[PDB]
Amino acid sequence: GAEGFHLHGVQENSPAQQAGLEPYFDFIITIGHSRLNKENDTLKALLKANVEKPVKLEVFNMKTMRVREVEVVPSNMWGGQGLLGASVRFCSFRRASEQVWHVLDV
């Protein structure tokens, strides 16, 4: 049901990595006072708006099944691509959960 931005990969030395974002088990649901429950450019916009500035995310961890507040500093100077330094996909929580549940090593 409840929609958000599934985290897909965290570039090295990123603002994402420095804040402790988990490449697949974290689900971003808030930035500032903006609930990320619609597929628009709100995430990008508020990252842009808060460049080199501390901004609070709410993030749902799929191992521990609960929400924390992560402080991130979006930035240009870290070296790689993007202000956060992470890949994300907008989806229902249901879909992001099932795509991490039953992975198999072979």
CB-CB contact of 27 with 64 (8 Å) = no
Is 91 a known ligand-binding residue?
Answer: yes
Method used experimentally: X-ray
Residues belonging to the chain: 106
Between CA 31 and CA 53 the distance in angstroms is: 13
User: Cα separation of 73 and 48, whole Å?
Assistant: 11
Strand-pairing partners, residue 59, are 28, 68
Determine the structural domain holding residue 16 and report its residue range.
Answer: 1-106
Q: Do the annotations mark residue 8 as ligand-binding? A: yes
Distances, alpha carbon 15 to alpha carbons 7, 49, 57, 61, 98, in Å:
13, 15, 12, 18, 27
* CATH number of the domain residue 98 falls in: 2.30.42.10
Helix (H), strand (E) at residue 97: helix 93-101
Contact assessment for residue 88 and residue 28, using Cβ atoms and an 8 Å cutoff: yes
Number of domains in the chain: 1
